[PDB]
Amino acid sequence: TEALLARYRERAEAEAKAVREKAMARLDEAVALVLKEVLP
Amino acid sequence: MIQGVIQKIAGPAVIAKGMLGARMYDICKVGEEGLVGEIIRLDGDTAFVQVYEDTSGLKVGEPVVSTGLPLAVELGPGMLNGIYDGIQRPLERIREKTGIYITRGVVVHALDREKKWAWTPMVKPGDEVRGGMVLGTVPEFGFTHKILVPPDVRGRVKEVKPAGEYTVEEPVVVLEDGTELKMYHTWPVRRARPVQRKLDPNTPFLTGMRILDVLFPVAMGGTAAIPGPFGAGKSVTQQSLAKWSNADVVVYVGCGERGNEMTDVLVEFPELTDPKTGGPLMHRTVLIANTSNMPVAAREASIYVGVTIAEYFRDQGFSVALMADSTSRWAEALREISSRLEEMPAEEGYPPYLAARLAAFYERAGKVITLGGEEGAVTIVGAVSPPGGDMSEPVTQSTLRIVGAFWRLDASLAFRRHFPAINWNGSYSLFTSALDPWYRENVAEDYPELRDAISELLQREAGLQEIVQLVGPDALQDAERLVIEVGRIIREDFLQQNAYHEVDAYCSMKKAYGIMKMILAFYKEAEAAIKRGVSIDEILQLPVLERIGRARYVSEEEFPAYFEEAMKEIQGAFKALA
Amino acid sequence: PVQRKLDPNTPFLTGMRILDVLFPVAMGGTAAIPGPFGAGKSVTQQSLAKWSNADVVVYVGCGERGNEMTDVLVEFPELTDPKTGGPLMHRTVLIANTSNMPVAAREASIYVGVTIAEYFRDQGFSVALMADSTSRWAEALREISSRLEEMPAEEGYPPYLAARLAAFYERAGKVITLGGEEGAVTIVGAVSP
Amino acid sequence: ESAGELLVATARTQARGEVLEEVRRRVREALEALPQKPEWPEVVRKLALEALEALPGAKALVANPEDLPHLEALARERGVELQAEPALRLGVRAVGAEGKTQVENSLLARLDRAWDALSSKVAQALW
Amino acid sequence: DLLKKEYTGITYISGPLLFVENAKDLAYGAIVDIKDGTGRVRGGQVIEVSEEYAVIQVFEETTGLDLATTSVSLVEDVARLGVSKEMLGRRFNGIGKPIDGLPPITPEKRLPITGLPLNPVARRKPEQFIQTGISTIDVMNTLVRGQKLPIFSGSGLPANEIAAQIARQATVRPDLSGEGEKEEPFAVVFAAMGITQRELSYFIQEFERTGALSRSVLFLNKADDPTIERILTPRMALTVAEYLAFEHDYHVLVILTDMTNYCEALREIGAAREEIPGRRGYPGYMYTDLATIYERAGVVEGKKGSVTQIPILSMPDDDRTHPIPDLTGYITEGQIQLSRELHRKGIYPPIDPLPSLSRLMNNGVGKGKTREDHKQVSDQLYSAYANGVDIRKLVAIIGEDALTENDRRYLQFADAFERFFINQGQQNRSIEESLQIAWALLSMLPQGELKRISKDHIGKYYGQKLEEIWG
Amino acid sequence: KKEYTGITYISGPLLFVENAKDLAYGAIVDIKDGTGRVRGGQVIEVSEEYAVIQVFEETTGLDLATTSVSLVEDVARLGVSKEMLGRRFNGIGKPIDGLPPITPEKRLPITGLPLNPVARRKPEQFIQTGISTIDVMNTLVRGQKLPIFSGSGLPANEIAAQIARQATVRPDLSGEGEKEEPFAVVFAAMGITQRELSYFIQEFERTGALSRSVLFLNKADDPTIERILTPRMALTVAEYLAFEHDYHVLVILTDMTNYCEALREIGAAREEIPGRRGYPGYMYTDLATIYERAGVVEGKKGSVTQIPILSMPDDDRTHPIPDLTGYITEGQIQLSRELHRKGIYPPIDPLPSLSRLMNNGVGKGKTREDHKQVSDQLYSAYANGVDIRKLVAIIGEDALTENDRRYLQFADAFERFFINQGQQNRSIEESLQIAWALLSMLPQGELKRISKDHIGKYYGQKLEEIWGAP
Amino acid sequence: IPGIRAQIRFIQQVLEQREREDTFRLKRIKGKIEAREAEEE
Numbered sequence A: 001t002e003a004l005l006a007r008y009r010e011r012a013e014a015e016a017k018a019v020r021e022k023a024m025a026r027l028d029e030a031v032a033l034v035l036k037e038v039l040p
Numbered sequence B: 001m002i003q004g005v006i007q008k009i010a011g012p013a014v015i016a017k018g019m020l021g022a023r024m025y026d027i028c029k030v031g032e033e034g035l036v037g038e039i040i041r042l043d044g045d046t047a048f049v050q051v052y053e054d055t056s057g058l059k060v061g062e063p064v065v066s067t068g069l070p071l072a073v074e075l076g077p078g079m080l081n082g083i084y085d086g087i088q089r090p091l092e093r094i095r096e097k098t099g100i101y102i103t104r105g106v107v108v109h110a111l112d113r114e115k116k117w118a119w120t121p122m123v124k125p126g127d128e129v130r131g132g133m134v135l136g137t138v139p140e141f142g143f144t145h146k147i148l149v150p151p152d153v154r155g156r157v158k159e160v161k162p163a164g165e166y167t168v169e170e171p172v173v174v175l176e177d178g179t180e181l182k183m184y185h186t187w188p189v190r191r192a193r194p195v196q197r198k199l200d201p202n203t204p205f206l207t208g209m210r211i212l213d214v215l216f217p218v219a220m221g222g223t224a225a226i227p228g229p230f231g232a233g234k235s236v237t238q239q240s241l242a243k244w245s246n247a248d249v250v251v252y253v254g255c256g257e258r259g260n261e262m263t264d265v266l267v268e269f270p271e272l273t274d275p276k277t278g279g280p281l282m283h284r285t286v287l288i289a290n291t292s293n294m295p296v297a298a299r300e301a302s303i304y305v306g307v308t309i310a311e312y313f314r315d316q317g318f319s320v321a322l323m324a325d326s327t328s329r330w331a332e333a334l335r336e337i338s339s340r341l342e343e344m345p346a347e348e349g350y351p352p353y354l355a356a357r358l359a360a361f362y363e364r365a366g367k368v369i370t371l372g373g374e375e376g377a378v379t380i381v382g383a384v385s386p387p388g389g390d391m392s393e394p395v396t397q398s399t400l401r402i403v404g405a406f407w408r409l410d411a412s413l414a415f416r417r418h419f420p421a422i423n424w425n426g427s428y429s430l431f432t433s434a435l436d437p438w439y440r441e442n443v444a445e446d447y448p449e450l451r452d453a454i455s456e457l458l459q460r461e462a463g464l465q466e467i468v469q470l471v472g473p474d475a476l477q478d479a480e481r482l483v484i485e486v487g488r489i490i491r492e493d494f495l496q497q498n499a500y501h502e503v504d505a506y507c508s509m510k511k512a513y514g515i516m517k518m519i520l521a522f523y524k525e526a527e528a529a530i531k532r533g534v535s536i537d538e539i540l541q542l543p544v545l546e547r548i549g550r551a552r553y554v555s556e557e558e559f560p561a562y563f564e565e566a567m568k569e570i571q572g573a574f575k576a577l578a
Numbered sequence C: 001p002v003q004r005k006l007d008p009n010t011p012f013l014t015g016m017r018i019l020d021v022l023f024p025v026a027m028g029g030t031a032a033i034p035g036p037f038g039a040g041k042s043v044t045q046q047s048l049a050k051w052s053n054a055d056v057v058v059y060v061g062c063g064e065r066g067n068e069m070t071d072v073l074v075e076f077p078e079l080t081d082p083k084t085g086g087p088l089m090h091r092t093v094l095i096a097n098t099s100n101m102p103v104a105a106r107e108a109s110i111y112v113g114v115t116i117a118e119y120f121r122d123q124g125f126s127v128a129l130m131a132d133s134t135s136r137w138a139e140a141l142r143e144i145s146s147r148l149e150e151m152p153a154e155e156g157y158p159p160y161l162a163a164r165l166a167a168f169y170e171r172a173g174k175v176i177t178l179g180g181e182e183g184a185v186t187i188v189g190a191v192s193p
Numbered sequence D: 001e002s003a004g005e006l007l008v009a010t011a012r013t014q015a016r017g018e019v020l021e022e023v024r025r026r027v028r029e030a031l032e033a034l035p036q037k038p039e040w041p042e043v044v045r046k047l048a049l050e051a052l053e054a055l056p057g058a059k060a061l062v063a064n065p066e067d068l069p070h071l072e073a074l075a076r077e078r079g080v081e082l083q084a085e086p087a088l089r090l091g092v093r094a095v096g097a098e099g100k101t102q103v104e105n106s107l108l109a110r111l112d113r114a115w116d117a118l119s120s121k122v123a124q125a126l127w
Numbered sequence E: 001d002l003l004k005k006e007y008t009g010i011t012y013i014s015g016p017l018l019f020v021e022n023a024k025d026l027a028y029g030a031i032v033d034i035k036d037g038t039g040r041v042r043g044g045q046v047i048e049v050s051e052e053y054a055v056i057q058v059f060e061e062t063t064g065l066d067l068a069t070t071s072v073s074l075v076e077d078v079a080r081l082g083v084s085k086e087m088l089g090r091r092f093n094g095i096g097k098p099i100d101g102l103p104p105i106t107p108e109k110r111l112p113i114t115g116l117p118l119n120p121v122a123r124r125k126p127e128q129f130i131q132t133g134i135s136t137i138d139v140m141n142t143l144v145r146g147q148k149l150p151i152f153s154g155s156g157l158p159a160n161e162i163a164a165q166i167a168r169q170a171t172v173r174p175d176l177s178g179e180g181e182k183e184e185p186f187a188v189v190f191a192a193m194g195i196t197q198r199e200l201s202y203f204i205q206e207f208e209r210t211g212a213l214s215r216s217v218l219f220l221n222k223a224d225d226p227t228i229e230r231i232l233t234p235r236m237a238l239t240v241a242e243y244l245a246f247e248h249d250y251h252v253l254v255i256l257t258d259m260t261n262y263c264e265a266l267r268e269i270g271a272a273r274e275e276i277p278g279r280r281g282y283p284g285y286m287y288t289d290l291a292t293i294y295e296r297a298g299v300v301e302g303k304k305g306s307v308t309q310i311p312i313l314s315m316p317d318d319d320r321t322h323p324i325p326d327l328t329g330y331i332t333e334g335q336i337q338l339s340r341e342l343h344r345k346g347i348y349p350p351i352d353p354l355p356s357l358s359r360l361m362n363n364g365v366g367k368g369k370t371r372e373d374h375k376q377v378s379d380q381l382y383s384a385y386a387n388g389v390d391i392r393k394l395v396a397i398i399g400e401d402a403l404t405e406n407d408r409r410y411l412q413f414a415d416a417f418e419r420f421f422i423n424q425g426q427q428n429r430s431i432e433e434s435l436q437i438a439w440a441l442l443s444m445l446p447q448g449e450l451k452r453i454s455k456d457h458i459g460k461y462y463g464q465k466l467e468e469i470w471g
Numbered sequence F: 001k002k003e004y005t006g007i008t009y010i011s012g013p014l015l016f017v018e019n020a021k022d023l024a025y026g027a028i029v030d031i032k033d034g035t036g037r038v039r040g041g042q043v044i045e046v047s048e049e050y051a052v053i054q055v056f057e058e059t060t061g062l063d064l065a066t067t068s069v070s071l072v073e074d075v076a077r078l079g080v081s082k083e084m085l086g087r088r089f090n091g092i093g094k095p096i097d098g099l100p101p102i103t104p105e106k107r108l109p110i111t112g113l114p115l116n117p118v119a120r121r122k123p124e125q126f127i128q129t130g131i132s133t134i135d136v137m138n139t140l141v142r143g144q145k146l147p148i149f150s151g152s153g154l155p156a157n158e159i160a161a162q163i164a165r166q167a168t169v170r171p172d173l174s175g176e177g178e179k180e181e182p183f184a185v186v187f188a189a190m191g192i193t194q195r196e197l198s199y200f201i202q203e204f205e206r207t208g209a210l211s212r213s214v215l216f217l218n219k220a221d222d223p224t225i226e227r228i229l230t231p232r233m234a235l236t237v238a239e240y241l242a243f244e245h246d247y248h249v250l251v252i253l254t255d256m257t258n259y260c261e262a263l264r265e266i267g268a269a270r271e272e273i274p275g276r277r278g279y280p281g282y283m284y285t286d287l288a289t290i291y292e293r294a295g296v297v298e299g300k301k302g303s304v305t306q307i308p309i310l311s312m313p314d315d316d317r318t319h320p321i322p323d324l325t326g327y328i329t330e331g332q333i334q335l336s337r338e339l340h341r342k343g344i345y346p347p348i349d350p351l352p353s354l355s356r357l358m359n360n361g362v363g364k365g366k367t368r369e370d371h372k373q374v375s376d377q378l379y380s381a382y383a384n385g386v387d388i389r390k391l392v393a394i395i396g397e398d399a400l401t402e403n404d405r406r407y408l409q410f411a412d413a414f415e416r417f418f419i420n421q422g423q424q425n426r427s428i429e430e431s432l433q434i435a436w437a438l439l440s441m442l443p444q445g446e447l448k449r450i451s452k453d454h455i456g457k458y459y460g461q462k463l464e465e466i467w468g469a470p
Numbered sequence G: 001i002p003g004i005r006a007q008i009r010f011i012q013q014v015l016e017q018r019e020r021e022d023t024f025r026l027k028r029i030k031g032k033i034e035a036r037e038a039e040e041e
């Protein structure tokens, strides 16, 4: 029903926000790894 | 600028050397007379230029100057009533400046520089404007012509002129950073004008012909092709759509065809009236005329100018219809250019990119949401003139794969003087399903079923015609002969349409619906009479058949009374005759 | 090379009554067979490979569909040889080319197969060579001819198609080998109009 | 009753793409302003040497006007002329012997032509 | 300007082409004079000029030329022909040089033979109906003033006889249009390309007997004359026609004896230049080249005179799908197609109406121009004839005895139509005679089947009988 | 990044670059101009003096002075992943749905390697397309190439979308019950207009079919080289999915006529002499390299099934494209115009249709013991109905025999109910039940092709599933 | 049927001859382009 679809979209956006927040922490380490790998 | 000299002259092709740095598809002034040319091939220090005019009398060594810009059109107020050539030069100005003969090298602005337009601002200083937003409005012939920002111009409004009379050159709007916006802007003809998104073609395009608007409809954003051998009635059909369409603006492109038909349009259309606005019909029609005796290189320019003007008017929220009088002429011009270029053809002389050019031209149509936020749509009806009626010719076969509708003409009906001479078996349309809600809401709740029944009867008649050709028409049973007779009735008094008769020329959707309902009611009553043993030949003598035949000559205003009376007459005739 | 060609005076017994009786083919002769979809052409060829008096069978697939070739490749290892009772593949050589394999390989497949057949014949055996479809091979030959920009002749087929077909079909015939031992090659070249 | 798959996939993909685009922007803005770092002459020396090595014949090297006084050793070794262009910030333009062929080792080009291979490892290291 | 410069150093002479080097100052499309060692001077036109060498097409044959002595000299930058009113009773060859023995024409002007494209705004609507005297033309395929109405012919079909009859009989009907004035006779510009001796003699004798030679400009290109003059001939003839019509208010009727010969010459030039061909080997620009000839006819706003074109072309084997008739039909306004079957029946003129067409018919006929029923009668005749032809096709299967009386009636209409309406011989039928014959023919059918005619016209005209017109 | 300045010739799609020996043949290059706009290009001929680059897009604005060319990759490569499901692409691997670009697990050449003939195996299990005229009489087996022969006006796209959002496997019929077997649909659109593109997007998203679909949509106004590459990209993704993740992949190619025309134009551009009928002489081999990438592999549980869709140019099967497709593919499904104009959808004509692998995919343990017999009986009965319906036009209803009238009724009800399915999703059991109900109209015992046991088991039912109880 | 078959085969022969002529002319133009590119350099 409509309630199920609304719950699905709410939970999808919530877990997307969770993924974004959990990747924010490791962003800097990832950027440092990319920088050290690219530069010869 | 890039300046060179003429190295070799061969018909409409001039090779200029010393043109390093010149860009492909740029405009060049070939010769001392400054003939308009386009660079189509670069080879070292030399450039290959196709001259949009006549090269007779040119001498080797004359200067060639490259303007550094591609072919462009002036888009703005002042086009809605004039006739233009392939490179958008006003033919009235050419006649005034040269006489009854079109002479090469005449330079004249596409938009009149003396006409004053009642400018009316629609923006305020400090406002942020994007491409396609409305800077203001100007009345042209009752059309609220909107002044638009060029699609790739961004900035903030600084100063806007007050309401008054100004020419197209007047910078009515001056943005910050010194950007001046005039009443008109130039656009390259080969770049499709950007849009926000494409919409689904929900509404139909009312051509005013019973067969085209009923059996094979074309939607508002759709594309149609009408191929046929010479004499079938392609151009008369194009003129009929121009006269009786429901499109706000009509762009007629006479690519490489007769000049007499262009004269006929220029003379008849001012007298005819706009079915919706009520004013003269000529006030909504833009003609790009490239007669067959004009230079071949101008045909591609004519097609592109027409479609670009159609796109520009679509950007103003109008509903534009674009009828190309011939695309096979464009293909032949491309073939001549390729022959000059010494290239290997793909099929029957045409260069390999002809299919890509046709696809790009036909894909410019469609209903879109403009960058200004409003709604606009362009419908393209492309006429095809195959050599000898050969529908396997590469132009027709490439058109078959990109059009949403296909109106095939056959020489058999043209010889019989049965017009519009549409080959029902060879025609199709892909918009029937998408237009059903509109037909239900605007015609009747059962219009799709009625049209499907008519198509089924025509299909049955076509299937039985095979046996008719084998055993004759009288060797069939009563039911099959009745089907044949009903198909004949349909063909003779529903699909037929006299494009010159004052009343039969236009036929609204409801009149065609009434005629279809009358014909199908007659079919059901005749089938009931046959099933009970009444002779078919007795049925064929009913004067109500003559009433059905005459139904198409009744005027729109007084049609519904005739429809009700004829339905009552059908019921009474087949109840009395059982 | 061979020592001497012999007259078609002995029968190639296929084990099927209609072909062996009404329309016989000599040991070393050439036959053709057009194969419709459901007409059991594959079953007929299997019976030729299984029951004929030929010692060694060579099967050549020029441009067969992948699944049609796969059926053959899966089913031959299962068929049994009546002469010995073991698998039939122990006297069969398969040359298989699908339509997506290189065109030159598809064109040279029949020559490779017939050369292998002639080599087996030179050992004194009787060989039945079965081209699975000569129309696919002719299509490959037409493709190669077009790639070489030769005159299309009739229906695009190169003007030397008849010459190549004659050269392929003349390799069949009962011969006396260079070693003085009798052998034969029989060709059943299927056509698909 | 099956749109949940599309919804969750779109949400996860949007989060992943936004995170990776932020990685792009942060690494791009960090790699900028290299001459402000005192170790820039060494890395641009490496850039110039690899650029001239890629070309069998070098005519001239074009770089930032302020970066010219840091590339004289290889210029004297190879005879290439130093040319000043403000547009070539943080990069060395290598010109072939004839001038038809030319190599650029701009840092943005480095990142653009490396990210396609890097992304597979970057995603696994990040998540 | 008038000083002579000679370009020697020819490097190639094959077929009609000729290459000359160090001629970079020869304008494109210029006319040159080729002088050989014997002193004879040929003609030539530049078709491709570059800084290396220029290509010149030779009007005459190349026999006797030699690379060591031949000399090429410029005449003028643009091919121009001297035109004047004095040439009304003159003959000329394919290149405008007089062949009647009279002194050369004193040119009032020198106009470019290539012409200029008429401005569509300056064109008028062709509305003046012309009563040709032929029923199949006057009624069903009406020819108006300023129209392009080619006659599609065959090998043995008498197209030249039909054209001569039209030129002898064609006139306007001032009273029917309400003008009520006397009208000057037509001036006939006769262009002949590859014309044989029989055809030329017949035309000369016909124009002598009718007395039109005193007002007819003739450009004659014999069949044995060089085939490159056929390229220039129609352009010169149409230039003279345009000059007369639009500078002296003459009404010019132009007859192009054979466009198939012109197409053959164009194909020869294209193949010599290795131009990319269209269908059947004809050059790609054949459509444009024929358009530049046909589109020179019409009427001009504010000008009294007009140019009416009646091209004659022979379809190779009666193949209407051939490139020549196809392109002509695409360019011109309809066609008058002759039928071989009708000719075999002895029906002259053998004009079968079904493939015939006149696009400007509606502008010339109707109420206040010829008669109110003209268009409706034409449509009814076309429909009934097509039904009769279909019924003939049905007879060819089921026999005449199996038909109903309706199909028998339509078949009788069809064969009486062919025997009376089309077949008129050498008589000059007025439009009223043609219309009354058409109504008499339609009277054979039941009155209720005239579904394409309004009841007013039916009541006013239905009822007449064929035997009543002539006994 | 190497940049190859020194363009010396530009004409149409071609441009010549000098001193560019380092460019590998077939490589993709990036053409840049004065404005900074970058175009696409493919190296079609490389030599010591110069290389020939064929430009994807239009060459307007290019010039010999400022044009620059740079290589991007030596061989045409596509980055594939399992996350491609639920995405849309422009036929060259670039997302067009607005979602961020995928993270490629691996990058594979689009010109996939041929399957080893001994590596394949027999197609054995069928695919349920939800269409009665396809499931029952023209069964599609996993690994088959079953083209759909359409016409100019026939609704091929609607049938394609219906099959795409209705196709499914039936593990319960085989007794496996393996719902663990994934299913994916790879859709390749070539030379489609905006209307067809919008229709496909809406149809794929309205029923959630996008969750198991990968869309390679190439517009009609896109460069033709992209049209050529689109089936290669789609088949590469399908092969990767099927043979690296055990997926059962169904591939739909629309429309192969547009692909052949693009191949024709590109071959003509490279100054190649056309073969038969003006098409390239190597058209057969190229179409084979496309089609023969479908099938099943011994030892692997994946499968690729192809449904090419091509429009006959004049409903003519003698045209080179349908001729070669019939040469390469196993059978065909032919759409009928007379059925379509009678209001029947899907307009599939059983008489000219054929499935060459049908006999191996139906029967005991696959669909049902009576499938093949029912299909044969339906074919024969429909042929009899059609010929009797043609005869009744001349001889009348009464003159026919009673069984002829029964065949008339059978043919009419067949066209009304079996073929005229509409927008339903019919499992094979439902279609078989409808077929048995239709055959029940014919007298028992006249059904010669079906054995008496199956007749006793199923004959007798009446028509209520389509009308009266949907 | 025999007459229609003869007509069909005659039309097929004519079309094939036209296609052969087109291919021959294409070969001629390709060869002449190659030759004129070679000697002119």
Ligand SMILES: Nc1ncnc2c1ncn2[C@@H]1O[C@H](COP(=O)(O)OP(=O)(O)OP(O)(O)=S)[C@@H](O)[C@H]1O
Binding pocket: C035, C036, C037, C038, C039, C040, C041, C042, C043, C044, C068
């Ligand atoms: N000699 C035969 N005796 C009995 N059944 C046969 C025989 N030949 C063929 N069949 C039947 O035919 C079917 C298998 O052969 P087919 O599939 O028709 O061969 P095929 O498909 O024509 O092979 P191709 O054309 O090379 S793909 C089975 O139903 C067999 O029972």
Ligand SMILES: Nc1ncnc2c1ncn2[C@@H]1O[C@H](COP(=O)(O)OP(=O)(O)O)[C@@H](O)[C@H]1O
Binding pocket: B228, B229, B230, B231, B232, B233, B234, B235, B236, B237, B419, B420, B497, B498, B499, B500, E358, E359, E360, E362
């Ligand atoms: N709908 C129509 N109704 C009546 N006459 C028509 C109709 N269409 C065409 N005709 C007739 O056919 C002639 C040829 O039509 P036209 O359109 O000029 O040729 P084409 O097919 O090349 O466009 C017209 O001049 C007119 O007499």
Ligand SMILES: [Mg+2]
Binding pocket: B234, B235, B236, B257, B325
């Ligand atoms: Mg027209």
